[PDB]
Structures are given as structure tokens and as C-alpha cells.
Structure 1
């Protein structure tokens, strides 16, 4: 009775974990995308300045 519950719990925990990790994946992905844009911009500014001079 115990063993079935034990394995059932293991499944449950491991499922919910996949979900929690997914949420965090999404949060850092949006941050990544914004950060990517910022790098492009900072580089772009350097180029603009160079062309300007």
C-alpha cells in the first residue's frame, strides 16, 4: 500500500517540478530576449558614433 503511494508521490512531485522549471524558463527567456536587444543597441550606438566621427 505504501510502495504504491510512494511511487505515486514521486510521479506527482516530478511532474510539478517540470511545470515550475518551465515557468522559470519563460521568465529568464523574456529577460534574455530583452538583453539581446540591449546588446544590439549598445553595439549599434558604437557604430553610429564611429560613422558620425
Structure 2
């Protein structure tokens, strides 16, 4: 039980870390798009 539990948490913690890292990339990508969207709005208003 303890042996299989330890292995399960190792595999589970491993998968948890991989997914967390993947979302971090998407979070940064979304951050760049957010700045781009807001920045274009400010330029559009400043143009006129």
C-alpha cells in the first residue's frame, strides 16, 4: 500500500507539474495578447 501510494503520488505530482508548466506558457501568451489588445485601443483613441 505505502509502496504503491508513494509511486502514485510521484506519478501524480509529476503530471501535476507538467500541466502546471504548460498553463504557465499559455498564461504568458495570454499576457502578451492582453497588452497588445489594450495597447491598440489606446493608440486607436490617440490617433483621432
Larger of the two Rg values belongs to structure? 1
Instruction: Give the TM interval when normalised to the shorter protein.
Output: over 0.9
Q: Equivalent residue for 1:25? A: 20
Gaps of 5+ in 2: none
Gaps of 5+ in 1: 1-5
Structure 1 segment 1-53 matched on structure 2, within 5 A: 6-53=1-48
In the alignment of these two chains, the number of paired residues is 48
After TM superposition, the score normalised by the length of structure 2 is 0.94
After TM superposition, the score normalised by the length of structure 1 is 0.86
CA-atom RMSD in angstroms = 0.5
